[PDB]
């Protein structure tokens, strides 16, 4: 039985590959061939926020499309007012090694985490006119990579011990644990209906999870290196990923396979972050060569370049109303484009 | 601007002063990275360290400078995903235990990756050889042939220790990096002086290469 089970595993893998082949009749490039291109897209820098003294690792927009938070290796969290470039809050962090941050949809909480292996929750709206720590979540055996809010009482985290978890803030415990990855989980993304989420790890694969039952639905493998970023389509039936092999790919859920590949011969550097537009016609990616490219999501053609940084672009972001794009970098600066 | 808009602008100015003060108070520190296999003497490298499973930070003060030491051994994951967080440190401290023939060929393997890393092209290394006394008493039983098979020489105390030092220094292939080596026992107390002198030579060399001499 120590070898009979292995034979059945290879048999089921071949059935899946043949089933996907039968569902492929035409490519997306063939279908969308008779569409006028979007053209040339040029964007200018409208704001430049200063005040950080080290590398910037993460940022997140608010649901009101005016407020945003950012994290840096100087041990500070800063909340900005993008319209007037005013600083609202500056929260000192106990551990200076930070890798991710999040902003609650309601607007009353923020999240932080890093090499300490604790996710920390901060209370913004309270008496005494100051920000105080509300909860410390412990239980991961590796560094925290990403975190996202579902409500004011639920949060999902990914870590470097090849697991994902869902927590209850008041109790301080984790209700569900998601397992199956082989390498370190690096990125995470939530669906608009918040009933499923997708993850990508260092085993060059992506998995679809069910929040309630805590099971695994589908697995996607098309890359050749580590996966760093992931994002959902606004419709909710597709997602995109970025890897270290200088390539972005688009995956479909109902067809359960890959649809498009975005690549060029002049790029040999990795991809740090990806994001979509409000309509879904544009895909934005940040690279290691200090730039940011704009792709046509339906025709796999370059449209524009955003070049204003002196070091590596670490993070991206698009407002809920699709009016601006924010970028962060290792030169302690973050800019707002339009 | 309205009455409340002017009040908000004044709040941002005070936050900008606190941020400026904290940056000044942080630039006058020396950051060092502590690496090595388990049971190599990392925890007791300096007698007067004070702690201030993730990352462990120990700080001590000497002369007038402030030293910060970071220990990362509790992260059993891929180093390449977080090794870039320590790109701007002054130097790297490496510890090797000479009484253990099992950790060998693993300490050498770990030393090779650090010395040939993309983010550490021009970072010097301060190398510590620990437990020389117990290594000397052990050599009367195992003549270093068990650990290193390709060894031919008079192995009393020195040619054995000289061989180990030559093995680590051969891993460096670069003209802008220097390796500092020192042998310590379990009772030596002048470890802070050795670190102080090595850092002083590092800053001098960095200043010459900024004026076109090296």
């Amino acid at each position: 039985e120590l070898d009979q089970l292995r034979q059945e595993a290879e048999q089921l893998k071949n059935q899946i590959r043949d089933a996907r082949k039968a569902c492929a009749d035409a490519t997306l490039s063939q279908i969308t061939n008779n569409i006028d291109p979007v053209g040339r897209i040029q964007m200018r820098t409208r704001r430049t926020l200063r005040g950080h003294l080290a590398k910037i690792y993460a940022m997140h927009w608010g649901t009101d499309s005016r407020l945003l938070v950012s994290a840096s290796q100087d041990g500070k969290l800063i909340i900005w007012d993008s319209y007037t470039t005013n600083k609202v809050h500056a929260i000192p962090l106990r551990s200076s090694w930070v890798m991710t941050c999040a902003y609650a949809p309601s607007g009353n909480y923020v999240a932080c985490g890093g090499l300490d292996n604790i996710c920390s929750i901060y209370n913004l709206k309270t008496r005494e006119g100051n920000v105080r720590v509300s909860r410390e979540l412990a239980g991961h055996t590796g560094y925290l990579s990403c975190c996202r809010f579902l409500d004011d009482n639920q949060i999902v985290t990914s870590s470097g011990d090849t697991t994902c978890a869902l927590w209850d803030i008041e109790t301080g415990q984790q209700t569900t644990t998601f397992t199956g990855h082989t390498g370190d989980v690096m990125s995470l993304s939530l669906a608009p209906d918040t009933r499923l989420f997708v993850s990508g790890a260092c085993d060059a694969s992506a998995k679809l999870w069910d929040v309630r039952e805590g099971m695994c639905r589908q697995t996607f493998t098309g890359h050749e290196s580590d996966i760093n970023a992931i994002c959902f389509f606004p419709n909710g039936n597709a997602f995109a990923t970025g890897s270290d092999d200088a390539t972005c790919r688009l995956f479909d859920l109902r067809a359960d396979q890959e649809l498009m590949t975005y690549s060029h011969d002049n790029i040999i550097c990795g991809i740090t972050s990806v994001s979509f537009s409000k309509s879904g016609r544009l895909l934005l990616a940040g690279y290691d060569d200090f730039n940011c490219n704009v792709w046509d999501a339906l025709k796999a053609d370059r449209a524009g370049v955003l070049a204003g940084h002196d070091n590596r672009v670490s993070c991206l972001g698009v407002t809920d109303d699709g009016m601006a794009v924010a970028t962060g970098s290792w030169d302690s600066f973050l800019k707002i484009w339009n | 601007l309205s009455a409340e808009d002017k009040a908000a602008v004044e709040r941002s100015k005070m936050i900008e002063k606190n941020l400026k003060e904290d940056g000044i108070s942080a630039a006058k520190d020396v950051k060092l990275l502590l690496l090595g296999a388990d049971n190599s003497g990392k925890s007791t490298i300096v007698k007067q360290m004070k702690i201030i499973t993730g990352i462990v930070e120990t700080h001590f003060t000497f002369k007038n400078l402030h030293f910060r030491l970071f220990d990362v051994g509790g992260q059993r994951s891929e180093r390449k995903k977080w090794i870039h967080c320590f790109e701007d440190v002054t130097a790297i401290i490496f510890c090797v235990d000479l009484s253990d023939y099992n950790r060998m060929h693993e300490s050498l393997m770990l030393f090779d990756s650090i010395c040939n890393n993309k983010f550490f092209i021009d970072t010097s290394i301060i190398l510590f050889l620990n437990k020389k006394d117990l290594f000397g008493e052990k050599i009367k039983k195992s003549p270093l042939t068990i650990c290193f098979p390709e060894y031919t020489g008079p192995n009393t105390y020195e040619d054995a220790a000289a061989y180990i030092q030559a093995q680590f220094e051969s891993k460096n292939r670069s003209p802008n990096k220097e390796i500092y080596c020192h042998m310590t026992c379990a009772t030596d107390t002048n470890n802070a002086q050795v670190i102080f002198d090595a850092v002083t030579d590092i800053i001098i060399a960095n200043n010459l290469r900024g004026c076109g001499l090296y």
């Epitope: 007012d81 609202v88 005494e128 006119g129 | 409340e4 908000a8 005070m14």
Partner: single-chain antibody, 230 residues
Framework: VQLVESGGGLVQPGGSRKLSCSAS????????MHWVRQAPEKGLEWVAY????????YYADTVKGRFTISRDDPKNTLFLQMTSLRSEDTAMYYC??????????????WGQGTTLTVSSDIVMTQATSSVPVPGESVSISCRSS???????????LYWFLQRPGQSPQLLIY???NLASGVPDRFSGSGSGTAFTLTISRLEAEDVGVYYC?????????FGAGTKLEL
């Protein structure tokens, strides 16, 4: 949160006194502070204001050159020095805290005052002076001499309630927003120069005097006050 004021008493005309206030339960250094007085036969009147960091000081036109305001952060104390006291200065003096950033709620906490006895502005008009009125709906109105709608999209109108034998408390800020710890039956609406406050499903403990204030520019002005009686 607690604010306690000390001082007061009987002072001869032409004299001088000093008033103090003590804070406990919040961060005193991140708040601006105000002084507001209430004559025995009048309503509320603004006096002075000192900013966080002591960078800005404002005075009313009728206390300029006579009164002084200062703060002490290590000891958590606010001061007020008065000289050349006339008979019109007899009132009860309150101490109010306020914070200023995007989305905040200034004028949110008031203290219990101390009595003192001595032997181009915008005009806010509240036409109603008394209304006899349970289980019903009432509406109050306030008027302005100039439009309070700024070019940034904010209307700077504030409401307050003063129960008998108590200190005033905040109900509505910026003409629409509802303060914390206030039942949802209070609502606010209006436009430039015309404002209204609506109370639905009236209950007990809602009796008292209601005031409208503007925060567009200094000095800050109040209304006459409308009284609700059973």
């Amino acid at each position: 949160v607690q604010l306690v004021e000390s001082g007061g008493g009987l002072v001869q005309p032409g004299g001088s006194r000093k008033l103090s206030c003590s804070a406990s339960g919040f961060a005193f250094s991140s708040f601006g502070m105000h002084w507001v007085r209430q004559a025995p036969e009048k309503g509320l009147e603004w006096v002075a204001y000192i900013s966080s960091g002591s960078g800005t000081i404002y005075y009313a036109d009728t206390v300029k050159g006579r009164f002084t305001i200062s703060r002490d952060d290590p000891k958590n104390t606010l001061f007020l020095q008065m000289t050349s006291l006339r008979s019109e200065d007899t009132a009860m003096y309150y101490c109010v805290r306020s914070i200023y950033y995007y989305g905040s709620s200034p004028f949110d906490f008031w203290g219990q005052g101390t009595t003192l006895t001595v032997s181009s502005d915008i005009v806010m008009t509240q036409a109603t002076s008394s209304v006899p009125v349970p289980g019903e709906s009432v509406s109050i109105s306030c008027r302005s001499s100039k439009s309070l709608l700024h070019s940034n999209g904010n209307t700077y109108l504030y409401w307050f309630l003063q129960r008998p034998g108590q200190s005033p408390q905040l109900l509505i800020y910026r003409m629409s927003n509802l303060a914390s710890g206030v039942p949802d039956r209070f609502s606010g609406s209006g436009s430039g120069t015309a404002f209204t406050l609506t109370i639905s499903r009236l209950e007990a403990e809602d009796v008292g005097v209601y005031y409208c204030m503007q925060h567009l520019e200094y000095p800050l002005t109040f209304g006459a006050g409308t009284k609700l009686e059973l």
